[PDB]
From a paper:
Sb16 angulates over the RBD by 83°. In addition, several non-CDR residues (Y37, E44, and W47 for Sb16), derived from framework 2 (27), provide additional contacts to the RBD. Sb16 and Sb45 directly impinge on the ACE2 binding site, offering a structural rationale for their viral neutralization capacity. Sb16 and Sb45 capture more surface area than ACE2 or other published nanobody or sybody–RBD complexes. Remarkably, CDR2 of Sb16 shows Y54 in starkly different positions in the unliganded structure as compared with the complex: the Cα carbon is displaced by 6.0 Å, while the Oη oxygen of Y54 is 15.2 Å distant, indicative of dynamic flexibility. Sb16, largely unaffected in binding to K417N, showed decreased recognition of N501Y and failed to interact detectably with E484K. Other cryo-EM studies indicate modest effects of the N501Y substitution on binding to different antibodies. In contrast to the effects of N501Y, E484K revealed major incompatibilities because of charge repulsion in the interaction with Sb16 via K32 and Sb45 via R33. Our new structures increase the understanding of the details of sybody interactions with the RBD, and in the case of Sb16, emphasize the dynamic role played by CDRs in adjusting to epitopic surfaces.
The virus exploits its trimeric spike (S) glycoprotein to adsorb to the host cell-surface receptor, angiotensin-converting enzyme 2 (ACE2), resulting in proteolytic processing and conformational changes required for membrane fusion and cell entry. Here, we take advantage of available sequences of five SARS-CoV-2 RBD–directed sybodies: Sb14, Sb15, Sb16, Sb45, and Sb68 (previously designated Sb#14, Sb#15, Sb#16, Sb#45, and Sb#68, respectively). These sybodies effectively inhibit the ACE2–RBD interaction and neutralize viral infectivity, and a bispecific construct, consisting of Sb15 linked to Sb68, blocked ACE2 binding and neutralized both pseudotyped and infectious SARS-CoV-2 viruses. Each of the sybodies represents an immunoglobulin variable-type fold consisting of two β-sheets packed as a β-barrel linked by a disulfide bond.
Numbering used by the authors:
A (entry chain A): 333 to 527
B (entry chain B): 1 to 119
Write the structure that this text describes.
């Protein structure tokens, strides 16, 4: 075994948009979760169904790291049984979720003067996302009874919008880098453990 | 085949009033987020106001302009308005409106100069 690539997902230069969140599969390595939980550089480190303290004592078959960027007021939606445009149309956590949600402020990294327009989000959808689903289509949403014919107009709108993170925004509109850890137990040798 | 040009700038005095208009073309400004930025000669480009694509509270303003500015969304004319009231000679600059629909779309800008004194 060797070290787990935690610095690759937590310290990446550019994170993914919430509508197109990335996933990093971590296997065949020893992981030290205590240094992540006790670093104080994370304003939110909330685990569901597992203790963050004694998280090192457990072994799992696979660990998934989902990373993206939302705004300040939307971090509370990265929780099980939560609702909102992020949880409904962008990233849904299951009701029986087992893992940890990690979110820290990244205004000094993800906001430009005049606005950083790289981070997007979904605004409309015909039906809510199932847990861990991921929508990518840029199809013009039909909000009315008239079809759209692939053209934006009345009741037909482009379903994606940008956050436009600029530094002097209020905290509720500043960028927040979010990492969601999922632990998997399978009929297979537990490949990731603690020190 | 998509653009937006702003108008309504010009000269005004003291606690005057001005109506900017970000006339959008080629797309419906209904569930879009418009930003208002301003640029005074030499200094940094400052964010002024913003109206969001969704939200219970869809209006956003900076601390320097809060209470005096109001950003509206005319759907019949397919344009976005910015109501600047009780002006001050400290907030005169070039005003821009930016939107994102697939890519960043810029306005050319408009000149707003408010004055003070006697004449």
């Amino acid at each position: 075994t060797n070290l787990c690539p935690f610095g690759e997902v937590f310290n990446a230069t550019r994170f993914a948009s919430v509508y197109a969140w990335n996933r990093k599969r971590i296997s065949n390595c020893v992981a030290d979760y205590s240094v992540l939980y006790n670093s104080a550089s994370f304003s939110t480190f909330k685990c569901y169904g597992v203790s963050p303290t004694k998280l090192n004592d457990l072994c799992f078959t696979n660990v998934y790291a989902d990373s993206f960027v939302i705004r300040g007021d939307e971090v509370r939606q990265i929780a099980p049984g939560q609702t909102g445009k992020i949880a409904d149309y962008n990233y849904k956590l299951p009701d029986d979720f087992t893992g940890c949600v990690i979110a820290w402020n990244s205004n000094n990294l993800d906001s430009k003067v005049g606005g950083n327009y790289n981070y997007l989000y979904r605004l409309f959808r015909k039906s809510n996302l199932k847990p861990f689903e991921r929508d990518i289509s840029t199809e013009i949403y039909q909000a009315g009874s008239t079809p759209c014919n692939g053209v934006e107009g009345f009741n037909c709108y482009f379903p994606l919008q940008s956050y436009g993170f600029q530094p002097t925004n209020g905290v509720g509109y500043q960028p927040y880098r979010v990492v969601v850890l999922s632990f998997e137990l399978l009929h297979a040798p537990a490949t990731v453990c603690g020190p | 085949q998509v653009q937006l040009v702003e108008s309504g700038g010009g000269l005004v005095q003291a606690g005057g009033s001005l109506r900017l208009s970000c006339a959008a073309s080629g797309f419906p400004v209904a569930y879009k987020t418009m930003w208002w930025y301003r640029q005074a000669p030499g200094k940094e480009r400052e964010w002024v106001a913003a109206i969001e694509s969704y939200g219970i509270k869809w209006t956003r303003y900076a601390d320097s302009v809060k209470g005096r500015f109001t950003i509206s969304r005319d759907n019949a004319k397919n344009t976005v308005y910015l109501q600047m009231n009780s002006l001050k000679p400290e907030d005169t600059a070039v005003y821009y409106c930016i939107v994102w629909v697939g890519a960043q779309y810029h306005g050319q800008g408009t000149q707003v100069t408010v004055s003070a004194g006697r004449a």
